[PDB]
Design a protein around this ligand. Structure first.
Ligand SMILES: Cc1[nH]c(-c2cc(NS(C)(=O)=O)ccc2Oc2ccccc2)c2c1C(=O)CCC2
Length: 109
């Protein structure tokens, strides 16, 4: 059942948004604000920006064919972060902590 699969995907995303993970998850809640952050090269380096709010909208709208399409967007959000930033960046360590939460829940769904 794909209704079942996406209920699980919604629960995973809702947990990623929960207070327990907020110390490291907050930079991923919304699209990267390139203008406010002065990252004028970001839209040239990152061809497909992704964030948790965009993913939530797609889940609500039922735009993912399966859990695999949901997973690929979550992993695109993390890969954009690892691609754009130096490996020692504070945001990369935050992306890794959030990805630890996602990979465990997603594998056990
Ligand atoms: C280069 C970069 N900076 C930000 C960032 C986004 C916001 N708020 S926002 C969502 O844009 O509304 C605020 C501050 C930010 O910088 C940080 C965040 C934490 C630690 C150090 C710098 C992100 C980012 C990414 O690569 C992806 C994830 C978010």
């Amino acid at each position: 059942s794909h209704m079942e699969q996406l209920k699980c995907c919604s629960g995973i995303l809702k947990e990623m948004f929960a207070k327990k993970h907020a110390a490291y998850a907050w930079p991923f809640y919304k699209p990267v604000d390139v203008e406010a952050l002065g990252l004028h090269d970001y839209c040239d380096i990152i061809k497909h920006p992704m964030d948790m709010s965009t993913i939530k909208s797609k889940l609500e709208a039922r735009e993912y064919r399966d859990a695999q399409e949901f997973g690929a967007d979550v992993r695109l959000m993390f890969s954009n972060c690892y691609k754009y930033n130096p490996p020692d960046h504070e945001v990369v360590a935050m992306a890794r902590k959030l990805q630890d939460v996602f990979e465990m829940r997603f594998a056990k769904m």
